[PDB]
Amino acid sequence: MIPGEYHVKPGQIALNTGRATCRVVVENHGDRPIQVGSHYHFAEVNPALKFDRQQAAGYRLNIPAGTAVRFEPGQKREVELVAFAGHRAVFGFRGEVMGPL
Amino acid sequence: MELTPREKDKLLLFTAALVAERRLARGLKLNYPESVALISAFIMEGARDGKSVASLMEEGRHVLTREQVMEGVPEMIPDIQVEATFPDGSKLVTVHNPII
Amino acid sequence: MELTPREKDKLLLFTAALVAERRLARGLKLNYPESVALISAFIMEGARDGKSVASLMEEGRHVLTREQVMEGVPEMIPDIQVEATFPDGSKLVTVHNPII
Amino acid sequence: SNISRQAYADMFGPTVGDKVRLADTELWIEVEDDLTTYGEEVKFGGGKVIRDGMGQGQMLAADCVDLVLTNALIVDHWGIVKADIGVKDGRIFAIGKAGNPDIQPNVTIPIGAATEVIAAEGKIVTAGGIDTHIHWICPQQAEEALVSGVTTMVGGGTGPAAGTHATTCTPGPWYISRMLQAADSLPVNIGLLGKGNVSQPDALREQVAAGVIGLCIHEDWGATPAAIDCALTVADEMDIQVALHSDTLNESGFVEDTLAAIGGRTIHTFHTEGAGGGHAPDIITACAHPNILPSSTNPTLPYTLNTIDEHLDMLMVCHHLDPDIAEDVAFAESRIRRETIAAEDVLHDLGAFSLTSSDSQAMGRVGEVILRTWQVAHRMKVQRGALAEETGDNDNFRVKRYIAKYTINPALTHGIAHEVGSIEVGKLADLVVWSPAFFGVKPATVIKGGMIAIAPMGDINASIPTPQPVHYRPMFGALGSARHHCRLTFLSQAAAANGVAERLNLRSAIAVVKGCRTVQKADMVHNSLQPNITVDAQTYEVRVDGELITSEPADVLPMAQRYFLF
Amino acid sequence: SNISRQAYADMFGPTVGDKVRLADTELWIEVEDDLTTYGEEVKFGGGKVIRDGMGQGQMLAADCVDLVLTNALIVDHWGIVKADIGVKDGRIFAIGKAGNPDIQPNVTIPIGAATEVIAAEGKIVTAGGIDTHIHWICPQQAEEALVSGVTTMVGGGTGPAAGTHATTCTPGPWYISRMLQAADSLPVNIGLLGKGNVSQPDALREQVAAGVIGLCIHEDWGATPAAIDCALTVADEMDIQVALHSDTLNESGFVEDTLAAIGGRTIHTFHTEGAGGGHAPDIITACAHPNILPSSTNPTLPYTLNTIDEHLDMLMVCHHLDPDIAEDVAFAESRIRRETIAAEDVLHDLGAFSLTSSDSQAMGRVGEVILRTWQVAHRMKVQRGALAEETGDNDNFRVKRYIAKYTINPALTHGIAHEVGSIEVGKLADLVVWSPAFFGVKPATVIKGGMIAIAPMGDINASIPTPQPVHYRPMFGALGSARHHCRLTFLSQAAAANGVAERLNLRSAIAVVKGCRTVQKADMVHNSLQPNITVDAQTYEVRVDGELITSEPADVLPMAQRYFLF
Amino acid sequence: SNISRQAYADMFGPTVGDKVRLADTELWIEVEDDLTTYGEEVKFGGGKVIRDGMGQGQMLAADCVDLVLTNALIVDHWGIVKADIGVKDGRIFAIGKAGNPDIQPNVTIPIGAATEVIAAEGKIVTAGGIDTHIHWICPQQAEEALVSGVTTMVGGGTGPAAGTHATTCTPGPWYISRMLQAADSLPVNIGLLGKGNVSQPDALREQVAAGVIGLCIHEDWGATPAAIDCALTVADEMDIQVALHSDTLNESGFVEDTLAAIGGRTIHTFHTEGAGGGHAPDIITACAHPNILPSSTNPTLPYTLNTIDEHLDMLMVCHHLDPDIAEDVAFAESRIRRETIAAEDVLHDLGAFSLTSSDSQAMGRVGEVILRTWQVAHRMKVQRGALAEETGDNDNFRVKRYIAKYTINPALTHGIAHEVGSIEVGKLADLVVWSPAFFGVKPATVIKGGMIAIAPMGDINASIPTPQPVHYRPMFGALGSARHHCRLTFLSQAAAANGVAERLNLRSAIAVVKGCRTVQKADMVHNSLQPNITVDAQTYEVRVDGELITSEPADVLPMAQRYFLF
Ligand code: NI
Ligand code: NI
Ligand code: NI
Ligand code: NI
Ligand code: NI
Ligand code: NI
């Protein structure tokens, strides 16, 4: 007996289903590490990350909400993006869009 | 003495620990509050003696064993934290999974 | 620990009982508050051990005798009451004429 | 991407189909629904979702909630569902999907710069309890009750005085005014009951006009047919509730005469089992009538090994009875009966008894109304198994039936259900957050009117709120004017119209009671059974449809020795 | 029918002719009268008298009292009688026979639906003490004093500051205003004293117009003939009291010069014995004059084995004296004299000293004014026997003489006797209920303005208010606006007329002092002796009519080790 | 006559040329000036100077101070001098020579009947500390901070909620209003910070109009260039301060990008060393710019033996980080760096870091801001010796530089320096009196707005305030309306003009912040160094002008085990 214990049923959860996604190769060209969040507009991440910014337009990382992806200096890896929804209006970040799209 | 609010608060932890200490001596299996109180006071005295944070983080896991506390209690305490005045000022001691 | 107001209040009864306990040990005849505090803490520990209400109502009358308390004290205490968490929850223990 | 169910539960709390044990009981709840869009959950923290342009929008205050309880597992009379809770203006704004509409789908609860966050993932959220049987013997009961999860207190008294010790009555205009003022200092919602034992209607109307939300008829002040009829007559015209503690001595008649005087009019019978007061030994039969809203006081919940031994002396002290006076002790065995004590537990399980209360410091424990309701549910599952209404392999229905006993049912019975009682939009945000290991015993957070009023807090000078010693301390919701803004003083409609709040210069929010004469047994959520119950005048045996009703005394219970220091 | 006297006493408390021991002293009181009609006593409880149509009537609120203290044994300067006490609008309504005129005879105190009940049978009821020598060194003294049974506090101070540590003075308009506001938070009646040491009348008038009810002349601020005369001149025109702590150093003259400056005008001399301050060593001779209202501070009451040893260091700390400075220590033996310390006890017994006070945290104990007055009475009975005024085999007269020392006499001296000081109709209901075993030591209930302010209370979550631990906790009468409504802030007539209460926005009830210039030694109830007392300049011996006055030091006292934990 | 210097110091405290050790540290202060006229010092007591016609004059209230702190040794950013302090209307009236102009020479601070006295001879007087990094996790922090000597608290929060646990933000109008009201109950000066992470200016303006005196940008809510720029734009137009806790993850850019978004506009960078948050690992380089007002949080002050071990787990709890999630733990070693931790101590000693704060219950200790600032000063003197600015054989300059870190510099940075921050005429009388043996650790008296708010107090029923147990208890300055009159609620100019105080019905005094956009590094008293500092991206080494900056970890510190019970 364990007070307040969970009895989670076995299986898996499919995240962000029914949404456009794309893979992108990203390379950290900075001298310090960089870490990106799940809902951050990818096309506006730290300028030291080299990748096709044009493709990541309106996308965010296809990872469980709240988690993050790290890039050590000089690191290169392929990440999967998922398209923003709702009104698809970006406000904030580095302020490159500040409106719909 | 000029006892500040925090020094008086700790007198509460100390007194709670006296209750647990006597009960364990009678040979009872300790409950949730009794456990936390007992291990927490252990650590405070550790700092008073001048033991380092690192030493106590380890010793804190050998105060009570799974066979000395009630069922479910070890899982009810994922870690224990208490601050005390060490020779080099106030420091935080975190003991992860104290009861095994 | 998550100590509620009532658990903290009992830490008062416990500490009051430590004072009486030491005094009786020196061989002093206990006074009014010292007596109540000492017998009251006896009962609480009784419940912690898991003794029944009925057993304690009896044992409570054999903690202190008329020759261990100050004059007039036994008549100043027609009964003693304290509640504690027994295995089957909170219960009230009433000890009538505890000192004889 | 994809995530395993276990990792998912550790991160955002359990989802549909997962089960959770309640504290250390045998009760298991199973999530019935989840209102989230998988992958779009909101989480607060460094690099998490609730950050500008992401899970936080650009809308102004008016367009977003003030508080969001993220990933909460709600347990209410209406469901056991996973959702985010939105709070605006101290009231429940919505139960849905929190986030930013600019980038997330299905957001029904907007998060903006003005939104504070309470991370409820892995916690169980419930409405605040409502104790309708308070003896105002001391102000210290409010803190005690609040720490246990009871956010509303109805009762009567003036302090430690013989009248109050014995009865829930705030006698007359002066004491009512005085208690109404003193109430602004207490961190819980309050409503007062006046003394209703009078055969002169005007003496009652005054008290109602003075501010009381009900009248308590107590045998210590004379629960005669004349008095009962008089109180119910005024209640009918002023829209207030009557709480009854009948004639135990059968001095003016038996239970059936009391039932006759009531005349099928709405009334809330206190401690219907009888141990706390009422016609000996069959006051329990009242639970069979459509106009009676029956409740129990907690000392008899649940039937255990020490219950009887304890009760013999608890009786005397309360009602100023003399252990030497034969007559004052003779009715002890007629008052405390093992047969009715055991039957009561079952009658709750069946829905025949609809409420639970304390009977604070007069045969009941103020901080144990929630704790004992669950100990009963546990014991009944253990002895009788699944209820006929259960579906699936969980105790979900039994949990809704028992949680309604100290939340919504008490709210309906006293005419305050329009303001509190459950987690429904528009209601005052009186919420309690619990860690599953401490459900029903010690809360993680207690929210009043939209602000945290009390919570466990560690070392004040510590670098984090978690180091020891950890104990309940008052928070901002319990301070000065913030408290006034987060609590309600319930008035009667007459008192409200007479300007009693302006004249007494009350600083708290005001709420008016209504619909006390129209509620009936059939309205009590999940607890509307009107059983054909009989009680044997001699053997004291309780029978429902001829079948014997009874249960066995527990030697050990959960939510007891594992959680308390004393 | 018929009932034996013993059973009668157990049921309704003692009656005419019965005697009761006060705590563990040698003092015995005997009931002088009983106002009840045998068989028609009112008792509260199940099946008792105070029930609808029986001991409770049908009258409206306006026609019945708010509170009734049933079967109380009153001890007051005017009698030791058995009666019921009626309370209405926070004031003493009547002392008579409570009940229902419809069915009972001689009912002078009506009980209705609006009447709360306090069962006082077997208890002793007294008025609240009044301490006229408070040093406001900390707010914590009010709770301490209240628990002991002192409901009114007069004194001065601003907090723990050198000026206040040494003197009872609230210096100037700003500090007075600040302390008047802070007072609303305290659960006792308060009146402030300003600094009266100034030879410029306008500097005093301001303080009086600012709100003080008196002026304290203290040697630490300069108790010169000029200052004394100036303060008494303003007092005469503003109707305020002057409290004096004379020139111990004889710097400006001896005691006879101080007496000369006073000029036969009304004045209250603080600690007239001298140990607490005043002309060394004969300030005690002042008790012989018609215009001097003399009082004692409690550390010297009564003369005991450890009194002298203790006092030597207690002196220094208080008045910031230096133990190394010869001059600061030389006047120690001139200040503390065994001869005057022993004589003081006798002078109280004779009625030459009319008041008792504490001198809180500056050579006196705030929670021991009542306790020590009785310890003196005990010791004096033990050593000198019956007073010449006694009648019958009881200590009744000695009890009235000593109880008046901390109740009515302090009330007359400061011009507040019209509001408090004794149990008389129209006075504020500041009452203290005691169990005979704890009389003078620990109260059963302490009532302020008609509401219980503090009382011993047991476990809050207990099923009854009696389980342990039992200790004093604040009740409703001590909360927010209810407290404001049950306490008085005494103002000077000028302050009242200037609208000081409206300008400072004081929330409590206001009372004005009056008749401070017209009281004299002959007005002090039971304590009006003006003895021909002399003091030997060298030997320090005190003589009254040439006969030597003295008493022996006690090794053990009652109301001590049997009641306290520390 | 003549008196030896030693006897003189024992009597009136040290004078010019005398040195005094601070607690048990190696720091020694030397009196630089004395404002008295030898032989004309004022002393309170029996036969002392402050008596009518002597050291006390005949002037009316308007012509004399309300309070005088006699013979005080002031330690302030401007000097370490001996003088009397005059207090009038809750404000500092003068720093000079107290007495009576009628008979004494050079009296600049008049003493009259309305003057209270605090004997400060032999004590050290300082202004009250100001903590600009408060997380309102609980109201209990105010008492804790007050007892340590901090009279002003700036920060944000709503209580124990995830948002507040992690950030100093009071989100939106409702929570701001609620916290503004709750603040009237707290005995310290308060100013709130709102959530500034929004790319929509109107959402910020509302919060400012609602009452906040600043906006906190926190990475947990998204510290992106857009958000930063938006907050600074509004700050520029509303005259409020912005407190920054940058992007530790370098998610939107490195430190130089944050610096770019700021655009040379005024900003206060929180915990500039980095351990508490900010761009890893070089957020420390910000202390080199003219527009950055840098401060440190106390857990890293000073570098000691257990600092690193402790910090690893302290990180997680605060910002709701998961020890299992690789990403949430990976940035632990990037956050906590021994190299920057040691360098910070030196950077303070040089004046490159201008403030010290706590970061209460989110990686910092509320009652240790003063204590730790001095422990650093001690350690730096021990390791680096005399500063280049020292003159004479004392640590005077190092003491002024370090005392300014928690007094005046925090006051300038947040625009409240016109009301508090130092001991200068016209400023609120927020003073702290210390015994030299307990300097920086436990105060003798803590004065708020002219009244003692908290002080160590002994047995309440004792004959003097000194018997044990002695512990801090609330005084009159902390009670009801007196408290309201002695504390300030800081509002923004917009909030003040909108009538927010009248609408929320705030009872305390109001003060408006101004000059937050015009302060710069060069304005920070004694701490204006803009060093050419670099940080090695890999080795994390800190270099100033190419030279390596570092210090050694202490194994033992003063103001620790000798003063505390736990
Ligand atoms: Ni009842
Ligand atoms: Ni009841
Ligand atoms: Ni005096
Ligand atoms: Ni005095
Ligand atoms: Ni931060
Ligand atoms: Ni912080």
UniProtKB/Swiss-Prot annotation, chain A:
Class of this enzyme: hydrolase
Gene Ontology molecular function terms on file: urease activity
Keyword Phosphoprotein found: no
Reactions catalysed: urea + 2 H2O + H(+) = hydrogencarbonate + 2 NH4(+)
Regulation: The apoenzyme can be activated in vitro in the presence of nickel ions and carbon dioxide, which promotes carboxylation of 'Lys-217' of the UreC (alpha) subunit.
Stated consequence of mutating residue 39 to A: Reduces activity by 20% and reduces thermal stability above 50 degrees Celsius
Domain of life (superkingdom): Bacteria
pH and activity: Optimum pH is 7.75.
EC number(s) stated in the UniProt entry for this protein: 3.5.1.5
GO BP terms in the entry: urea catabolic process
Pfam family, one: Urease_beta
One annotated Gene Ontology cellular component of this protein: urease complex
Quaternary state and interactors: Heterotrimer of UreA (gamma), UreB (beta) and UreC (alpha) subunits. Three heterotrimers associate to form the active enzyme. The apoenzyme interacts with an accessory complex composed of UreD, UreF and UreG, which is required for the assembly of the nickel containing metallocenter of UreC. The UreE protein may also play a direct role as a metallochaperone in nickel transfer to the urease apoprotein.
HAMAP family per record: Urease_beta
Protein name: Urease subunit beta
Species of the source: Klebsiella aerogenes
Organism ancestry: Bacteria, Pseudomonadati, Pseudomonadota, Gammaproteobacteria, Enterobacterales
Curated annotation (Swiss-Prot), chains B, C:
GO biological process: urea catabolic process
Pathway named in the protein's UniProt entry: Nitrogen metabolism; urea degradation; CO(2) and NH(3) from urea (urease route): step 1/1
Activity regulation as described: The apoenzyme can be activated in vitro in the presence of nickel ions and carbon dioxide, which promotes carbamylation of 'Lys-217' of the UreC (alpha) subunit.
Record's catalysed reaction(s): urea + 2 H2O + H(+) = hydrogencarbonate + 2 NH4(+)
Entry superkingdom: Bacteria
Metal-binding as UniProt keyword: no
Pfam families assigned to the protein according to its UniProt record, in alphabetical order: Urease_gamma (PF00547)
EC number: 3.5.1.5
Localization annotation: Cytoplasm
MF terms in GO: nickel cation binding; urease activity
InterPro entries per the UniProt record, alphabetical: Urease_gamma, Urease_gamma/gamma-beta_su, Urease_gamma_sf, Urease_subunit
Assigned keywords, A-Z: Cytoplasm, Hydrolase
SUPFAM superfamilies, A to Z: Urease, gamma-subunit (SSF54111)
GO cellular component, one term: cytoplasm
Activity dependence on pH, as recorded: Optimum pH is 7.75.
Hydrolase recorded as keyword: yes
NCBIfam families recorded: PRK13241.1 (NF009712), urease_gam (TIGR00193)
Similarity field: Belongs to the urease gamma subunit family.
Description of how the protein assembles with itself and partners: Heterotrimer of UreA (gamma), UreB (beta) and UreC (alpha) subunits. Three heterotrimers associate to form the active enzyme. The apoenzyme interacts with an accessory complex composed of UreD, UreF and UreG, which is required for the assembly of the nickel containing metallocenter of UreC. The UreE protein may also play a direct role as a metallochaperone in nickel transfer to the urease apoprotein.
Name under which the protein is recorded: Urease subunit gamma
Native source species: Klebsiella aerogenes
Organism placement in taxonomy: Bacteria, Pseudomonadati, Pseudomonadota, Gammaproteobacteria, Enterobacterales
From Swiss-Prot, chains D, E, F:
Localization: Cytoplasm
Enzyme Commission designation: 3.5.1.5
Free-text description of this protein's post-translational modifications in UniProt: Carboxylation allows a single lysine to coordinate two nickel ions.
Effect of residue 318 to D: Reduces activity 20-fold, but increases KM only 1.9-fold; optimum pH is 5.2. Reduces binding of nickel ions. Resistant to inactivation by iodoacetamide
Residues in Urease domain copies: 128-566
Pathway: Nitrogen metabolism; urea degradation; CO(2) and NH(3) from urea (urease route): step 1/1
Residue intervals passing through the bilayer: none
Protein origin, superkingdom: Bacteria
InterPro entries according to UniProt: Amidohydro-rel, Metal-dep_hydrolase_composite, Metal_Hydrolase, Urease_alpha_N_dom, Urease_alpha_subunit, Urease_AS, Urease_asu, Urease_asu_c
Catalysis: reaction(s): urea + 2 H2O + H(+) = hydrogencarbonate + 2 NH4(+)
Mutation effect (residue 218 to N/Q): Increases KM 100-fold; optimum pH is 6
Positions bearing N6-carboxylysine: 216
Cofactor (UniProt): Ni cation
One cellular component (GO) term of this entry: cytoplasm
SUPFAM superfamilies: Composite domain of metallo-dependent hydrolases (SSF51338), Metallo-dependent hydrolases (SSF51556)
Cofactor info, note text: Binds 2 nickel ions per subunit.
GO BP, sorted A to Z: urea catabolic process
GO molecular function, one term: urease activity
pH dependence of this protein's activity: Optimum pH is 7.75.
Binding site for substrate: 218
Keywords: Cytoplasm, Hydrolase, Metal-binding, Nickel
Outcome reported for the amino acid change (mutating residue 220 to A): Reduces activity 1000-fold and increases KM 10-fold
Name the UniProt record assigns to this protein: Urease subunit alpha
Originating organism: Klebsiella aerogenes
